[PDB]
Write a protein that binds this ligand. Structure first.
Ligand SMILES: COCC(=O)N[C@H](C)c1ccccc1
Ligand SMILES: COCC(=O)N[C@H](C)c1ccccc1
Ligand SMILES: COCC(=O)N[C@H](C)c1ccccc1
Ligand SMILES: COCC(=O)N[C@H](C)c1ccccc1
Ligand SMILES: [Zn+2]
Ligand SMILES: [Zn+2]
Ligand SMILES: [Zn+2]
Ligand SMILES: [Zn+2]
Lengths: 362, 362
């Protein structure tokens, strides 16, 4: 069976499980089950499934080099698919809550879930809560007798918690740290002193890299009982590195990819986000460029946003991006080598992960 | 050491642990740690700690009848306090998210967390996420080598998930089930056909009774290694029964307790909630009373809300409440007896829990 078809089939199976349980254990009625069914489909389906499929790809790579009964290959691939949907549903929780937090309009060419007419914020906050709760129900049911259950639960919770802390770093990135204060309404920075490469790197490490790259790779090792084929410090290192590059790409597209192709109107500038573009611009600007940036960044006025886009265009940030890219190519290729000492297989999976990111066009 | 002082001391210990970890593992800076510290204090402290202290009370009752080394008594009471704060922090997650969902203003005489000037909804949704994440970090750290760790994690997740499903039942209780539909903006019921005792009971069972009464009692059994001193079906039965009574009290106070003493302006009527008062009123009203209720319920207009309060007052709902109360006194006293077959101790703890609820004046 082809991996994607397996993956999709298990979605159906998990969905039926979750909704049937609601009916047998939680007294749900047909109409609320249907609401939840729709919510699950709308919030979990329609992406590329890169995260979830990476768990399956990692587990297929070990199946090719490890001796097992056919029924054990099937059980490993079924566990890889369940674990991959745990990650997809965890992403769906974060996207639904993030979209409400940020006042987002669209995602992927469709309205954000909270904007659906019959959802509203009052239901959507709780729908997002439920999405994450469903990851736990999956694990306790499908993995109940598995040796990896503790490790997988403990990894998932650390990853979830990192991601929430990253969300906190992201949404406070345009404030001065020393002025954070629940009692006092928060002004936008005026100095941009915290728009640095290391502070950027912190935000991105936590907000995206743990759930997007670290979790899929490590979940694939866990469902395969293969965590001894790797040096975990290397897998963390490469995950964080590739995931940073991924976010840098996102940041560039937020500004420059036209909305119809982006699936969104990008507002990082108006939102005063600490984006790769802002940090890299500041890192090369002269005094007058810095002043013009300060006078225009973090405002809804479209003329001011255009002045920012103009400044970035004139600043030849494509060049700094090519330099960044070269350096990441270099470091990721080194880490893949350190990963071969223990597993060619695991290294190849990391190689694919890299190729898909590096060569992604959307 | 007195139980409450122990309990409070462990708060300090857990808080320090959580913030120190943020600094050693998650790259936090001092100012964001301080933000989180304040958020934890504001959202977790200032109640009666009834839920968390019930875990400690249940564990103290078993200590009086079970032989242990002093160091084991201390470890049990420390685990009971950690487990009690897991429950308090889980409540704090639900209160912060519920207040945003419902557009609440105050809680306990202070602004809701999201309304603080330097919080805002964008941070508060994620702060609530973090609150629940902290319950997991507590458990994996304090209970890492404990025999009850799996059982406690599995119970906590089922309770969390029930509570979210209860939130869904609560916020959709004024819509017709057969019209739920993410695509279509939801009208208020006009028939009130779903304002029934059984539908009420479902809402309350899930929204409040699992986290408020079932979880504290069962966590106390788990940290004591005492789940064989009970028949779990009875503990579930009594938890749900007492927790229903608790909510009925809340519902009555929402309408009739003056705001300064309530800590809140009550809006259940304007919000068209399926409250005990509405269900009980409908269950005794004549045709003209039902019509007047329909014409006035679920509106912000204060004249219409006063017409509802008037209808409830004239309807002698104190009498139906006394009848309800008598019946609950009767059934809870029976369950306490079935609970004595296996544990006098556990029965007494349930007795205290009941007394505190029955005789609570706030
Ligand atoms: C829609 O964008 C076209 C496009 O090639 N996007 C990819 C993802 C990309 C690569 C490198 C830097 C920025 C963006
Ligand atoms: C690929 O995105 C659309 C786009 O026009 N990007 C431009 C060429 C760019 C700017 C800054 C950094 C990298 C690339
Ligand atoms: C502030 O309310 C006074 C008061 O006694 N409240 C308690 C909680 C109560 C008991 C029974 C029914 C309703 C309310
Ligand atoms: C105790 O709350 C304040 C209050 O005036 N309550 C009244 C007496 C009441 C109405 C309906 C049901 C029970 C009690
Ligand atoms: Zn965001
Ligand atoms: Zn972006
Ligand atoms: Zn609510
Ligand atoms: Zn209430």
């Amino acid at each position: 069976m082809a991996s994607m078809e397996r993956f999709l089939s298990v979605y159906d199976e998990v969905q039926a499980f979750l909704l049937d349980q609601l009916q047998s254990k939680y007294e749900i009625d047909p109409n609320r089950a249907r609401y939840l069914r729709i919510m699950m489909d709308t919030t979990c389906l329609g992406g590329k499934y890169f995260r979830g499929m990476t768990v399956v790809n990692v587990a297929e790579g070990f199946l090719a080099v490890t001796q097992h009964d056919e029924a054990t290959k099937e059980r490993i691939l079924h566990d890889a698919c369940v674990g991959g949907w745990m990650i997809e549903f965890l992403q769906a929780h974060y996207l639904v809550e993030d979209d409400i937090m940020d006042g987002s309009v669209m995602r992927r060419g469709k309205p954000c879930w909270y904007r659906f007419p019959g959802v509203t914020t009052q239901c959507a906050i709780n729908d997002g809560i439920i999405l994450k709760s469903w990851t736990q129900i999956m694990a306790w049911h499908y993995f109940a007798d598995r040796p990896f259950l503790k490790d997988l639960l403990c990894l998932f919770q650390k990853v979830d918690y990192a991601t929430a802390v990253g969300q906190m770093y992201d949404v406070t990135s345009m404030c001065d740290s020393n002025k954070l204060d629940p009692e006092v309404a928060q002004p936008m920075t005026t100095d941009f002193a915290e728009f640095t490469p290391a502070i950027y790197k912190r935000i991105v490490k936590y907000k995206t890299t743990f759930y997007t790259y670290l979790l899929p790779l490590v979940m694939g090792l866990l469902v395969s009982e293969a965590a001894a084929s790797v040096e975990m410090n290397l897998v963390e290192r490469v995950a964080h590195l590739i995931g940073e590059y991924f976010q840098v790409q996102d940041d560039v597209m937020d500004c420059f990819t036209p909305p119809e192709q982006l699936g969104k109107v990008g507002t990082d500038i108006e939102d005063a986000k600490c984006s790769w573009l802002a940090v890299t611009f500041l890192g090369k600007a002269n005094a007058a460029q810095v002043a013009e940036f300060k006078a225009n960044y973090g405002e809804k006025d479209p003329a001011k946003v255009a002045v920012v886009k103009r400044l970035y265009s004139k600043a030849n940030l494509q060049a700094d991006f090519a330099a960044y890219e070269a350096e990441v190519v270099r470091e990721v290729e080194s880490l893949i080598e350190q990963l071969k000492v223990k597993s060619p297989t695991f290294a190849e999976s990391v190689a694919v992960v890299w190729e898909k990111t590096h060569k992604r066009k959307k």
